[PDB]
Amino acid sequence: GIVFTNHNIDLLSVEFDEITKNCNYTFSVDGETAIFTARISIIRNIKGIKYSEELDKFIMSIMPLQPKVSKILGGVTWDCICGKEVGFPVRLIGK
Amino acid sequence: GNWTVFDEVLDSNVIKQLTLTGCGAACGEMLLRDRYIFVTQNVIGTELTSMTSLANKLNKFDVGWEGNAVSESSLYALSNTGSWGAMMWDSGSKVGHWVLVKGVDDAGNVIIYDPYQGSRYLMTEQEFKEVWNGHSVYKP
């Protein structure tokens, strides 16, 4: 394959709203901060995260660099929701 | 497509994708077919690759489809709803590949209908969980 330019993308924070189930994610994209939203969805014991349309587009663009990136984001999210202490920042993509 | 499978057979009941990106729409056609809705992959749109865009399109012909990143641990709860679509993304690939998860057999293996060649095969639950990137289209 060709060269895909590498990046450092970190997850800086996860803010979960117990009432609305909304989730605010703050990423660092090579130092530039950006906020994306999602909604937590537990239905018939299926533990899902409904990314916003723009978050899904963003994740799809970096999947070629790290196909595990939703597993990382999801793992952190469920730990946060369950009240575990999570040390941030958490690497999503590194060079 | 380098992931490990067994008992693979060509199966003309699996809908074969018509283009590289067509696997989402091919899965979408089979997902709707299982619910007595008959829409060709061309009408669904063989450019659709993201779970958001695929669930949104299925909800033009049906109702109640979700397109979410799902935990590995929800595999059996997903298959309890019927067939669902899983985005496979193996190491080194620059693209995802949608497959239809038909169910799980009695030994717990995952039964896959794959539109790449139009085949049916099995995967161990552990291997399936590693290659599936969590992105999923399903109808609770």
Residue numbers in the entry:
A (entry chain C): 2 to 96
B (entry chain A): 3 to 142
Article excerpt on this structure:
Here, we demonstrate that one such protease toxin from Escherichia coli, Cpe1, disrupts DNA replication and chromosome segregation by cleaving conserved sequences within the ATPase domain of type II DNA topoisomerases GyrB and ParE. Cpe1 belongs to the papain-like cysteine protease family and is associated with toxin delivery pathways, including the type VI secretion system and contact-dependent growth inhibition. The defining feature of this protease family is a conserved catalytic triad, consisting of a cysteine (Cys) thiol group, a histidine (His) imidazolium ring, and a third residue—either aspartate (Asp) or asparagine (Asn)—that orients and activates the imidazolium ring for peptide bond hydrolysis. Therefore, bacteria encode specific immunity proteins adjacent to their cognate toxin genes to prevent self-intoxication or harm to kin cells.
To circumvent this limitation, we co-purified Cpe1tox with its cognate immunity protein, Cpi1, which allowed us to obtain well-diffracting crystals. Using selenomethionine-substituted protein, we determined the crystal structure of the Cpe1tox–Cpi1 complex at a resolution of 1.87 Å. In our crystal structure, Cpe1 features a six-stranded antiparallel β-sheet flanked by five α-helices on either side, forming the typical α/β core that is characteristic of the PLCP family. The catalytic triad—Cys, His, Asp—is clearly evident and aligns with prior functional predictions. Despite sharing limited sequence identity with ABC transporter-associated proteases, a structural homology search using the DALI server identified ComA (Z-score = 16.3; RMSD of 1.9 Å across 121 aligned Cα atoms) and LahT (Z-score = 15.9; RMSD of 1.8 Å across 117 aligned Cα atoms) as the closest homologs. Interestingly, although Cpi1 binds to Cpe1 and they share a large interface (1,050 Å2), our crystal structure reveals that Cpi1 does not sterically occlude the active site of Cpe1. Instead, Cpi1 primarily interacts with a shallow hydrophobic concave region on the surface of Cpe1 that is located adjacent to the catalytic pocket. This binding region consists of a cluster of non-polar residues—L387, M390, A408, M426, W428, and V434—the hydrophobic properties of which are conserved across many T6SS- and CDI-associated Cpe1 toxins. We did not identify any enzymatic domain in or significant structural homologs of Cpi1, suggesting that its neutralization mechanism depends on binding to the hydrophobic concave region of Cpe1 rather than occlusion of its active site. However, when we mutated all four residues (Cpi1mut4), the resulting mutant lacked the ability to neutralize Cpe1 toxicity and failed to bind Cpe1 in vitro, despite being expressed at levels comparable to that of wild-type protein.
